[model samples]
Target chain A: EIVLTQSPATLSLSPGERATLSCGASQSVSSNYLAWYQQKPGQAPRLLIYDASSRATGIPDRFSGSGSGTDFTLTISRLEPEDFAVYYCQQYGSSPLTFGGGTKVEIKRTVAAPSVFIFPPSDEQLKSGTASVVCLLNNFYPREAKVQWKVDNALQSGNSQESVTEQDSKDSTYSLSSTLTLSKADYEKHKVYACEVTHQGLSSPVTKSFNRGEC
Target chain B: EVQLQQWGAGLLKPSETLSLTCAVYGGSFSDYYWSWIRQPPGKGLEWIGEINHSGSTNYNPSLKSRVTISVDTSKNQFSLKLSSVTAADTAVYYCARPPHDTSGHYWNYWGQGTLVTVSSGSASAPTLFPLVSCTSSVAVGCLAQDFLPDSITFSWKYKNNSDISSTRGFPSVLRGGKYAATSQVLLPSKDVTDEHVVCKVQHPNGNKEKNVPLPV
Candidate 1:
C-alpha cells in the first residue's frame, strides 16, 4: 500500500484569508471515498469532508473541499471566529482507511506548522442583527448532504440554490448558494441562528454559524 | 472555534492505569465529545469511548467496566482513564473525535502511541549452569579435554540413562568447536532434574570420549 503525503507541516493565515492543504495518496486511492477531519485540542476529530465530495453531518458552509484521483484539497474559505486547528484526510475506498499526516496552524511557532489554517489575528466580529441564513455550499458536489437553516432556534427548510461551477487547471470547483428569509421578530430578537449540513456517514450533522453568536 | 492536538505516552506497564489527554483551543466549550481508541500492537483498531464537554461520557461496551473517559469542555480538553491494566491491555492509545451525529460513531482520527511497562520490582534472580560439555578428541572409550576444531562428530544411543558404547562414528571435522563422541548422553534439562546419565565429547582429530554421572 502506498502512503499519503501531506506537505508544508504548518500553515498561518490572517482572518478572512484562506487555508488550503493537500493530501495525495501513495497509490491512486479510489477518490470516490475520501474524507477530511479537523481535530482541535482535547476534542474528537470532526469530519469536515467525506466520500471525496460529501460533507459530514452538520458542517459549516465556509469549510469547502475540492480534488479527485490521487490529489485532493480541503479549503476553508472566509475563516470564521473558530476555524483554527489541524486537518487530516482519510481514504474510505480502501480497507485500511488511512489518514493524512496532519497539519497544525497557529500564531506561536510550536511544532513546525504541520497542516493548519489560522484565521486572521483576533479580528473578532461584532454582534449584529440577524437578517438571512443559508448553507450555500451544501450539496454543491456529488457527496450526500442537506443544507438546513435554523431561524430563531426553529428548523426551517431551504430551497437548493443554483449550482455554480468554477474550473481550474487540475479539477472543477462547483459552488451553490441559498437564502432563507426569517421573520422580523425571529431575526432581530433571537441571538442564535444556525446552518447545519448533514450527511449519512455520521451520527450527527455539523452545525456552525455565519454572523451569529460565538460561531 | 476550539481545536485540539495531543501527544504523550504510548507503552505502559502491567497493573497500571493508562491515562492520556488532548488539549483544545479555538472552539467553544459547549458541544462535542472527546474520544479515545486503541490498536493492538499490530492488530485491528477499537473505539474506547467519548467524553462530553462537561466531563460526562459514553463508553465502549468492551471497555466500559474498566474505562473512564472524561472531558473538560471548559478547558477545551478531555482525558481517558483505564484501570487495573495487564499485559493484554498493551496497545497504542489514541485520542480522537467521535462521529458528530448520533450515528456512525466509529473513530475517524488517531494519535501516535506511548508505551508503558509494569513488572514486580524485585532484587534477587535465579540462574543455572549446563550439566554436560561434549568434546571429541580420543577413541570411543577415552575421555579427552581438547580436540581438533574441525574433524569429529558423535551421535547418541541410550538405555536406562547409560551410554551404549557400540555405535558407528562419522570421522569428519566439526566445523568450529569440540564435538562429544558418544553413543548416549542425557540432555541438560533431563539430567538437571537429578537423573543419572552419560556425557560425551567427540573430537574432529579422529578422537572421542565419554563420562558417567554428568556434572551440573
Candidate 2:
C-alpha cells in the first residue's frame, strides 16, 4: 500500500514569496507517475501536472511540477490572491487510485493591543492587572484592513469588538486590526478569540485563523 | 455511460477449461481496447490482456503465451479464454475498457465481473467444457506464484483433505501496490476424482492462509 502525506492547510504567499507544497509517497511514485490539481470550492478538480514534469493536455507554465521518486514538490510562481486555496496530488499505482491530503493557502492577519477606548477598556486586575496583545498574521497583504469579532472562528456580534483599517499612502499598502473586550476573568488568564479581517483586491475571498493568548 | 453485462460458465471439474464474455451497451465498441482482468475471491487484481474492436490483441507478458483475448465489434462484445486451467485460475473475472492503447494505461472504468469456476462440480452455474476440448492441442505451461519455506506461496489442494497436489507450476506473488499472487494452471484430465483445484496463499506471516477453489 502506497501512502501519501500533505501539509500546511493554510499558507500565506506574497507576490514574490515562493510557494511550495510537499508530498511524499510511501513507495517510489517515480515510475507510477504523479499528478497535481487545483480545485476551488464547488468545482471539478483541474489537472495541473501529469507524469511528474510534463504538464497535462492543457495547463499554464506558471503552475509547474518538478520532483522525482518519493519526494516531490508543486510550486506556483507569482502567487495571486486567487491562488490562496487548497491543492492535491494523485498517484497512478495499481487499482484503487490514491489522492493526497489537501493544502489550504490563506492571508495571515495580526491584531494589535486593545488601546482605543471607544468603550471603557474592561480590565480585570488579578495578579497585577495586565492588558497587552500583538497577534501577527505571519502571512498577509493589502495592509489597509478591518477585523471583526468571531466565535469559534465564525463571525458573532455583541461580545465586544472594534476594527481599524490602516493604508500606506506611499506604496498604497493596507492592513487591518480588530479589538475585543473580555472581563477580568476572561482577560487576566489566557483567552481564546478570533481576529478576522476583510482584505482589498482579493479576487477570491480569503479567511485566516490563529490561536492567540498568553504572553 | 456505457453498461456492460458479463456472462460465462461458472463451475468445472479437473482437466476442464474456463471461459467468459463481456457485452457493451449504450456505446460503440470501436476505437477502444477490450480488457480482461481477474480478482481472486479475496485477492487484489490481475491484468490479463486486451483486444481491440478490430480484432487486434495484446496479453500481459506474464500470461501472454497461454492467454487469448478476442472481440466481436458488431455485437459490441469481447471474450477471454484461459487454456488447461485449474483451480488456481478460479477468480471473479471481468472484461473492461483499457482506457487507451498508449504506453501508460489506466482501468478507469470496470464491468461487474462474473465468477467462473472449473472443477468436477456439476454445471449448476453455466458450466461448459465444449470450448476446452477444441484447444487441447495448445499445451501451454501456466506458472502460478511460487512459494518457498520462507517465501510467499500459492498451492493447489483438496477442500476437505490436506492432500495438496498439482501439475501446473506454482503461483507467483509480486509486491507492486500490495501483495498479489496469480496462478495459471493447466486443465486436469480424468482420473482426478471429485477434486477441487485450489489456489491457497501462505502470506509472509506464517499464521494466515487463503484458498480460492478452481472449478474441476
Candidate 3:
C-alpha cells in the first residue's frame, strides 16, 4: 500500500516564500520510511517530516527534510504565517500506510462558504423515540468539506457522522460540527433528517435539515 | 493537545489475539508515533502498526506477521497485537499518534475506536497481508491491495530475470468490498537498466517480496 503522489496540487506561497513540498513513492521507501504533514483550516494535522529528513519534535528548523528512496522533500525555509495550509505526505516503509493527496499551500486564492446549522434532537433524544441531528457549519474558508446524511430525501446508512472542523485560529476562518443518527422510525415517519455539505467554498451543495426544517 | 485513552478486548474469539492498549495522555509521550489505526466495518482506514518512544517500529508489510506494535515509555502507553485471528479479524482498533522520529502520515492523536468484532459463529475481515506496491517507475506495478479471497499470486523480477515477458496480473473489488490485485509491469521504457525490481506474492496468509529499486 504505497501510493503517495503529492505535488503542486496547489501551492501559492504568500508569507515569506521558499516552500518545496513533494512526496512521491510507489515503492522503495525503506528506512527513509517517510512522513510530513501540516493541514490547517479546522486544524489537526501538523507533524512536519519524519524519517526522510527528520523534523518532528517542535518542528521548525524552518522545517526541512531531504529525500531518499522514491523521492521525498518538504522544505519550508520560510513560509510562516503559520505556513499557509494543506501539505501531506506519509509513508512507512510499507503496508497500507500511505498518504499524499494534499499540497494546498495557498495565499494565491481563498474561498469561504459555510453557515449552515441544524441541531435538533434532545429533550432526552426526543423522548427516547430516536433522534439525532447537529449539523453546524459556520464561517468557512479554503478547507474543503463534505458530509451527507439525508433521510427523507433518501441516503442514510448507520448514520452517526462527524465533520468537527473548527479553525478560527483567528482568521483564515472555518468551523464545523456534523452528526445525524436517527431511528424511532425516522422520527415517527416525519423523517427529514438532512445534513449535506460539499464545499470548495461552495457554489452549491450546502444543506441543513431536521425533522422537516428548523434551525 | 494530545490525549488518547485506548482500550482493548471488546469481544473476540474466532482465533483470539487482537489485544489493544493506549494511554498517551496530554503531550510529550517522547513526542509521538504510537500508532495502530483500523476500521473494517464500513471499511476505509487501516494502518495497523507503529511504535516510537525509542521502541522504534514500523510495520504493515502486510501485517508483518500477525502484527505487533508496542511501546511503553514507562506506560506513557502504546500497544497492539493481532496474532492468529480470523473472522477476517474484525476491527475498530485505533490508538494512533503521529510525528516523532520524523515519521508522519497524519494522525495527530486519536483513540476512540475499539470495536474488535470477530465472532465465532461468523467470519468478517481477512488481510494482514497483500499490499506489495510499486509506483515509482511511473506505472510499474505490483500492488496487492487489501486482500481477502480475491485469490492472489504475482511475479516479476527483472535484472535477475524472472520472466518479464510483458508481465500481467489483475483483480479489483474496492468500494469496501476490498481486495485489489494488479501486476502490470509491461516493461520496456528501454526495458529499464534495473537496479532492482522484484515483486512476488503468493498469499494464503503469507509469502511476499516487493523489492523495487529501479534507480529511483
Candidate 4:
C-alpha cells in the first residue's frame, strides 16, 4: 500500500505557461496502476492520463503523465483557459487504491467582481431581541472573494457567516455567495450596516449598505 | 462508443442495503471490466469492487464482507449491493469501465454520479492495528485487528522481490463487531535478508501501513 502526496497544493498561472503537478507515493507504484484526472467545478472528474504516461480517450496531447514507482508527474504543455481546475492522481496497482489530495490550477482574473444584497429582520421581529440581518454576495469570480461587515463605519467581527464558490464548468468562470448576520441590537437601533466585498480581480472593494427600514 | 448509465435509490436508513445498477449501451459486454467506485462528500475516491463479463469478481478487501458485485450478460448490465450500510457509507456512487488494454486497470469511462445519503448517526472510526512476525527466515505472518465499520482491505509486499507467495484469511467478526484478519507469506531465506516486509490496511475512515524488519 502507498499514500500519494501532491506537491505545491496549488498552481497559479496565466494561459500558455507550462504547469506541472507532482504526485509522490509512499512506496513504488507499478506503471500500469498510475492515473491522472481533471475535475472542474461542480462536475465529475474525468480521466486525463493512465498507465503512467498515456493520454486517455479524447484527452489532448498537451496533457501528459510520466514517472514510475515512488514518483510520478502530470504536466500540461500549455495552460489553456479551460485548464484552470483541480487535478488528482490515483494508484490502482495496490489493494485499497488511493488518491492524492488534489492540486488546483487557478487563473488570476483581472476583473473579479461581486454583487451584494441585504435583508433586514421584519418590523415586529426586530423587537423580539432575536432578530438578525442577512447580507448576500453573488456572482463573484476567482473564488477567492472576501466578505466583511461594518456597523456605522466600524468593522464588526464574529458574525455568523456562510460562503460558497461555484464554477461554471462550461466556461471556467466562478460564482460565489457569502451570507452574514446582524445582531438584534443592531437591527433594533436601525444602525447602518455595510457589506464590503474584496476580490483580487476588482480594482477596489465593492461595498453595499443597509439599515432597518420602517420598523 | 460505449456508454454506462447508472441509477439507484438515493436514501437509506441505518442497516439498510445500498443497491445500484449500471447498464452498458452500444458496446459488447463480454470483454471488459465493470466497476463501482464511490466518494464521500468532500472526500477522496474509493474502489468498491469489479466484475467482468465472465462473472469473475474482485473486491476491495475493506468492503468485501458486505459487498456483492454481479453481472447480467443477458441485459448487458452490472450491479453493486452493499448491506448494513451506515452514515459512513454515504457517498456519490459511480459505475465505471476500466481500459481493456494490457496496462489498463485504471478506470477511464464513468457514468454520471448518483448521490446516496445515509441518514444515521455518524459511524465511528476504525481502531486498526497491524503486526508482522517472521516465524523463520522462510516464512512471515501478519495480523491486523479490532477495526470497526467493517470496510477494510489488506495488502502484503516483500521488498527486493517482485514475485512472492501469500495467503490471506477473510475478515472475521469479533465479539464487539470489529473485524480481524491475518495473512502469511512464504519465501526463500536468501530473499528475506535485508528485505522489508510490508503489511498495509485500508479502511473506510483511513489507511495504515506497517513494516517489519528481519530479526537477524
Question: Which candidate tops TM-score?
Answer: 4
Isolated chain A TM-score, each model:
0.48, 0.50, 0.34, 0.71
Please give, for residues A67-133, the per-residue lDDT of candidate 2 as tens digits. Answer: 7788778887767655655677766644334567767555443432221111112122123342222
Native contacts recovered, each model: 0.01, 0.01, 0.13, 0.29
All candidates in order of TM-score, best leading: 4, 2, 1, 3
> lDDT for each of the candidates?
0.49, 0.50, 0.63, 0.69
Q: Which portions of model 4 show Cα errors greater than 4 Å? A: A111-115, A121-133, A138-141, A148-161, A167-173, A180-215, B120-216
| CAPRI rating of model 1 | incorrect
- RMSD (Cα, Å) of model 2: 28.6
Place model 4 in a CAPRI quality band.
Answer: incorrect
Ranking by lDDT: 4, 3, 2, 1
Better of 2 and 4 by TM-score: 4
Residue A142 C-alpha lDDT in model 4: 65
Residue B211 local lDDT, model 4:
61
> A158 in model 2: Cα distance from truth in Å?
73
Q: Candidate 4 lDDT, tens digit per residue, B27-128?
A: 678767788988876666788888888898888888999999999999999999999998788788989887673445677778888878676433344432
Point out the worst 10-residue segment of candidate 1 chain B by lDDT: B122-131
Candidate 2 vs candidate 3: the TM-score winner is 2
Measured with C-alpha atoms, the lDDT of residue B21 in candidate 2 is 88
